[PDB]
Structure 1
């Protein structure tokens, strides 16, 4: 084995750079190193609240990314356009790191490595795809079994259970993968109190956070997805007012331009998988926020080349 090795059993910046190059060249991280990243990140994530609360000082910035879906070569492109993660270049990845794309192992181990390296400045939120039922169908379980073992997949599944469900910046911007709720009156403290170390329920707040979508018309509708609901601008307005928030950032839907701003400014969608599944032809985006100005600034980007592996190859 001539690949990346941890230093004294821990992730370092040189390890991360080595890992990204190793993965770019389509090589596999040693199972023992992969194992170590997973057990260590499980410990880090298990200490976090279900609602991560982050302060951004006046001069501080953060980058919010949406779905990446195993598009490892596009993930590297994000880091090239926007710089590597660091204490002065923080990131939030808003779920759906795996499935669909066929470099999910590479995406997720890279993200977990950066979580270990910069735990206070690199944030991962759970998506609907960081769950067993979805992984079984949409490629990740198959990919892990092909590259490693069923045992390794079990460990991934356990780590995903500890991913936080939402993040609030400066008490003003709430970020979650899916969206708001099937019932009125859900509070930030309700989110904090969700016992999240589980596969999501078929209904209720944990489900909604991972699964819901905005709709343009007032009210709520039964979701076309078969789970959770669609929520109108009245739902968002009420939730924001009750919780003293300005707006929400969510992901979970492909958008041709990589982003959308719905509900009169109140519900932003960011999607970070360009040319999704090598078919959709969409742009992707990420968002910059600054402590001095929490209004979203969108940065669009397009797909870059990847190796000759089809989406869903491992499903």
Structure 2
């Protein structure tokens, strides 16, 4: 696997008009999947990370915005990174996006981290774009190879014992962090239970306790659920993604939870920026923002 050649070709299009493709070979992409999969399985499913680091939310195949994020934050390994999932679907360049992310995971496996989002799941990305992209530009055998890799992604991260990170949110079944560590891989995402909620749930200002989720799966949770979770586990902050927010980032429950969304101009109902969160050496949080076009 010539990792450096792959990274060079993916970065070659920096400064081109957005949309210009990078077409790796089928064998190169398969190697990225197989090697990254082995690294995911060798590291814990509940990551324990240290700041300083940069944290990104949803990318959804917006490859040229991923390149901008790295331009603002520093290309790996100049900065350490944690991504919260949803790399594929909706955008026009899911393939370039996930290939660069997997290449950097293999190149800097202790300084670059990827969590699983609800779109890293074959039942979802079959219908939301990634299957179609693979079939058009490669073949369905490669889509299955991607699925096998996605099924091994870690689920959550704790930064410096104070910031709990996952794609979706909390679960009524989350009583101990050991419940996350016990989840075995490879796994698909179930349509209910702890792993489902970690990838699908949402905070909601109008809900007391646990509520129904308009997505049709999992739950909503209120501000008091957050405070009790933070107190019980001695945490300062929940950092999650999964929901489009107009400013790219959005605080909840008196800044005890933050939502990050890193794909600008994602949505037709309202403009949105994309944001990346900087966590410094004292765990202070600040933001770098891709403003809407």
- In structure 2, what is the equivalent of residue 47 of structure 1? 42
- In structure 1, what is the equivalent of residue 81 of structure 2? 91
- In structure 2, what is the equivalent of residue 152 of structure 1? 142
- Going from structure 1 to structure 2, the CA distance change for 1:18 and 1:27 (only over 3 Å counts) comes to closer
What's the offset of the Cα at 1:150?
A: 0.9
- Going from structure 1 to structure 2, the CA distance change for 1:279 and 1:28 (only over 3 Å counts) comes to farther
Asked if the contact 2:260–2:277 (Cα under 8 Å) also holds between the matched residues in 1, the reply is yes
- Going from structure 1 to structure 2, the CA distance change for 1:73 and 1:160 (only over 3 Å counts) comes to same
Distance across 1 between alignment mates of 2:50 and 2:222: 29
1:45-65 Cα offsets, whole Å, 9 max, x none, are 111211001123xxxx20000
Asked if the contact 2:22–2:96 (Cα under 8 Å) also holds between the matched residues in 1, the reply is no
Runs of 4+ in 1 over 3 A off after TM superposition: 22-25, 277-280
Aligned residues: 288
Are residue 38 (structure 1) and residue 33 (structure 2) matched?
Answer: yes
Are residue 172 (structure 1) and residue 162 (structure 2) matched?
Answer: yes
Distance across 2 between alignment mates of 1:73 and 1:208: 30
Alignment of 1:256-267 (within 5 A): 256-267=246-257
Are residue 192 (structure 1) and residue 175 (structure 2) matched?
Answer: no
1:155-190 Cα offsets, whole Å, 9 max, x none, are 00000011000011111101100000134x522111
The partner residue of 1:68 within 25, 43, 59 is 59
The partner residue of 2:95 within 76, 101, 105 is 105
Asked if the contact 2:192–2:217 (Cα under 8 Å) also holds between the matched residues in 1, the reply is yes
Distance across 2 between alignment mates of 1:128 and 1:37: 21
Asked if the contact 1:49–1:164 (Cα under 8 Å) also holds between the matched residues in 2, the reply is yes
What's the offset of the Cα at 1:272?
A: 0.1
What's the offset of the Cα at 1:221?
A: 0.4
What's the offset of the Cα at 1:32?
A: 1.3
Helix, strand or coil at the partner of 1:174: strand
- In structure 2, what is the equivalent of residue 313 of structure 1? none
Q: Structure 2: where are the runs of 5+ without partners?
A: none
Distance across 2 between alignment mates of 1:202 and 1:28: 34
Helix, strand or coil at the partner of 2:284: strand
- In structure 1, what is the equivalent of residue 191 of structure 2? 202
The partner residue of 1:21 within 4, 12, 15 is 12
- In structure 2, what is the equivalent of residue 284 of structure 1? 274
Asked if the contact 1:96–1:128 (Cα under 8 Å) also holds between the matched residues in 2, the reply is yes
Distance across 2 between alignment mates of 1:27 and 1:215: 39
Distance across 2 between alignment mates of 1:277 and 1:255: 10
Alignment of 1:135-146 (within 5 A): 135-146=125-136
Distance across 2 between alignment mates of 1:18 and 1:63: 24
Q: Aligned Cα RMSD in Å?
A: 1.6
Q: Structure 1: where are the runs of 5+ without partners?
A: 1-8, 305-315
Are residue 124 (structure 1) and residue 117 (structure 2) matched?
Answer: no
Are residue 11 (structure 1) and residue 6 (structure 2) matched?
Answer: no
Q: Judge which range, 37-46 or 67-76, deviates more.
A: 37-46
- In structure 2, what is the equivalent of residue 308 of structure 1? none
Distance across 2 between alignment mates of 1:113 and 1:278: 32
Distance across 2 between alignment mates of 1:89 and 1:233: 32
Q: TM-score, normalised by structure 1?
A: 0.87
The partner residue of 1:230 within 217, 220, 230 is 220
What's the offset of the Cα at 1:291?
A: 2.6
